[model samples]
Target: AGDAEAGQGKVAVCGACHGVDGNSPAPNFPKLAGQGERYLLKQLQDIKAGSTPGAPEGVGRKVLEMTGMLDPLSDQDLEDIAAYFSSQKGSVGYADPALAKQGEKLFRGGKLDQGMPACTGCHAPNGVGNDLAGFPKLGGQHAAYTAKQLTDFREGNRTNDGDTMIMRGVAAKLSNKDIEALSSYIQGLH
Candidate 1:
């Protein structure tokens, strides 16, 4: 839907944090490579317009670094950027095998006693996620980034996860150890 060649030029500014290939140089930054086009576009739109419903101002995590980055860009530019990033290769990080057992249990089966659903239900068994459903790919993502997001959801600092509040509900039941294990597993899921 977009010209990758054209998008490449427009993404020079983004390279500072996201890297030239969209993989990101730091663990705190999300890797945009191999992400779904729709997901990326949606995130860009949300960051630009600040239209995340149910997300209270000064409460949830804000895209402060991304603020105004889209001011000069057109819809076409955003689309192009998404296209380019989605076409690139994703990151592959190391996972602690020590947490594998616990992580795998939570990701694949979950704790029925706690009313927690398996992450694979939405994110896919391989962590590829449901692109059409707007779910994001979690495999190979930085553990720190994933952990922070999970923590944010649980703490009410990131309530933009839709009407069902699925992430909020799931995260609420996860202990720090669960979060750590899951994050570690997902980082090396591939």
Candidate 2:
């Protein structure tokens, strides 16, 4: 399921931004450490396949225009990179403890009166999401980014149906503050 050797070379291109260990020092660029293997593969595939948008105008537009950067890589290279990233530690942010308490309540058990269910049911306790299923490690993601993704899915801007139904349902029920609180706490969780 991996080719560490090919990954070593192929990852050189990624290291320029994502860091040698997959932790990006750049503010907006995501740290890929501890990311799930299948999630990484899907994201790369989405960028390559044009299912996901590339860099916006004025910022490395030409470089971003290139698609399928990993197309030439063998399956082993993909697996190797996935393995490597998955082995590293993810970032941890701090949310206000009071807010985090509220967030944890929502995360563990949704508002039943509002038709929400426990996110932990799917994401798992501790946010160790299912890798083979491509469920991402939401524990340490940026709160803003997390909220944006939920909004995108809610607005139908992004659709990966395998789990979109559940996300959409949940997103629709979430208030802006609810989203913010949950996202904030999640970014700090192990």
Candidate 3:
């Protein structure tokens, strides 16, 4: 079992970017606090294995900045790490007013003509993504991190989404402006 208590000393190295409790200090790094356990496990697996389901070897969504961080971890260690982070609280972020204004509509209803589905459908109104679906919580996450992932998904650089490719499809049609607007908008969610 992935006991959060046992994971206490396991995340010392991860504190560099993901914070001691998983609320990252920088906007470019993702906040793992209160993130979905399944999503976190999946990412940890992908990062370490260097591939996702159905993807070729080396096709995982490897964050170059992570480099060798996941190399020394075991499966049990990852689950423990995921459990610890999922139990922590996430820090909140405020959205840019201008960007939030421009992004709200698209987030709520999406652009059918643009081939993107409403973010609210899966991410929910407050951006607390569906955990059962293994969608990580989006609310209170860093805008920079969100934008980078969206852009990465758009270019097919990240394949951890596996076969469904929901994010890939959504991010595909988004322009930089749309992504910018959405990123800031999502940052402010609870």
Candidate 4:
């Protein structure tokens, strides 16, 4: 129901940090470019109401950055914005070669012996994400943002994944070094 062309007009307000293309230049702001529409819609709804949609007991995502930004917007506005942003191109970053190798291994072959399912199982081999599942694309996302979000999940600060607990489970097992490597690899993904 979202119209990207129509959303273009609404997205101007989002261009401050998240570029008009949805590719933010700042590492603190995660790029929404090419993100899954479902994921974006859910996030907008969550940020606005301070609760996840569809899940009665779903946790809310705390967004101090844009506390009241989404308050005035309607669901349709969010949907159209999702359409516009997801239709744009995302940017990638540089990573240390050795670090990237470790990350690639972690992403492609999570230590099955250690209870870590491969990230590719959800996020895809190319880090493009699973749209049907509303998983996010890791490739080209800001490493700093990813690191922060991972840290949030690890510390139980961000539990909005709606009881599935996949992120929490994975983050709980990740060490700081692992986070560093994974973030680099995701940003530098080919």
Candidate 5:
């Protein structure tokens, strides 16, 4: 897994959306830098297997249409990509200082009045989400990625769990301000 060389030719298809450095220039695409290797592998496999649904429109669906590209990748190739992105430094989401207090409170304790569970309850105290559970780490993640996923979950573009509809429920009532604040606080955690 660690010794595989860059499959640049094969990876070119990814660069079209994920960028050469795994940082997507496009808003709809997720920036993959510093993502956990295991999480990346799972997502790659999920996309190929259609376990994760695709975006309904634009370059995202095209970028993720990897039916052909993923077919030929050896397990080692996937590992190398996971390793590549994990090894890179990542961009951190930001928050205005004024909002940091409320943001931190929400991130650490959740908004009980709103029926929001503490993110740490599931994502871990450090914000290093459980890779085995397919929960990608939110610490040091791009703000845009967090916001996008929240928006996706809110809009029915993404789903998980059974009728519990975990993320769907969490994102359902989050205002734009909530998204920005919470995501920022998460990025600040270990």
Candidate 6:
């Protein structure tokens, strides 16, 4: 548990990129608002530790940006920031309606012939995600951000996933069109 008020003061440095309300102004930065506390905290801890066990060296773009930002913070401080961000309202962006149907199909029922698994299996049908399992809530996320992450996972630039290469494997089989459709679908999921 964290004090949201106390967390506010500690997040001033983060506003430059993440925005004061946790909804990032840039597509490259992820929206942190309304995210699960455990997922946020876990990411912060992983960034500070520099690597997830069983993953490769150095994460990716955002991790590089966050380098040294957490060095002076305590575990409690990390928790407070996560708490503050999670308390804010999330992004309200929606996907292009035209692409949503294709995205929805992929999200709800992956191409079994291609060995692609349904995103809902882990992220939930509503895109709320499994908080206890640390899968992030993808509803209403930025399409570009989501697409970049999927690309990163596919290219092996970001490998901090905890499911024994689950994301990497899944992303590997997806074509660029699949990534785009999925990203578009997730943006309007809410």
| Clashing pairs counted in every model | 1, 1, 0, 0, 0, 0
Error of 2 at 1 (Å): 2.0
Count clashing pairs, candidate 4.
0
Please tell me which predicted candidate would have the highest TM-score against the true structure: 3
Per-residue alpha-carbon lDDT of model 4 for 1-190, expressed as tens digits?
A: 5789988998767799898788878988999988888888887877777632333443477677776677778889999988888788877788887778888888898867779888998898889998778788888888899989899989988888854778988888788988888898998774
Model 5 — which ten-residue stretch has the worst lDDT? 55-64
On residues 60-117, what C-alpha lDDT tens digit does candidate 1 reach at each position? 2367677667768788888899889999999788888898678988999998999999
Instruction: For each candidate in the order shown, give its overall lDDT on alpha carbons.
Output: 0.84, 0.70, 0.84, 0.83, 0.66, 0.83
- Model 1 CA deviation exceeding 4 Å by range: 51-61
- Considering only N, C-alpha and C atoms within 3 Å, which residue pairs clash in candidate 3? none
Which pairs in model 2 have colliding backbones?
Answer: 48-68
Mind giving the per-residue lDDT tens digits that candidate 2 earns over 1-190?
A: 5554555567877787788887665644566888887887666555544422454432211224335466576656677777778778887776777677888899998989988897887787888788877678887777766777677556655555334467767777788788878887887877
TM-score of each: 0.89, 0.77, 0.93, 0.91, 0.69, 0.89
Model 6, range 1-190, lDDT digits (tens) per residue?
7777888999878999989989875887889998888888888877877733333465522376776778789999999988998899887677887888898998999889988899999998878887788788999888888998899899987677854568888888888998999999998887
Candidate 3 per-residue lDDT over residues 1-190, each given as its tens digit: 4788878779988898889999877889899999888888888887876633344554666666765677788899999988899889988898999998777888898998877788998899998888778777898889998889889889888877875768888888899998999999999987
Question: Model 2 off-target regions past 4 Å?
Answer: 25-27, 51-76
TM-score of 5: 0.69
- What's the true lDDT of residue 152 in model 3? 88
**After superposing candidate 4, which stretches have Cα over 4 Å from the reference?**
51-59
Candidate 5 per-residue lDDT, tens place, 29-127, comes to 677777777877755654544422443432122223464466567777777777777666666555556765676777788778888887887788777
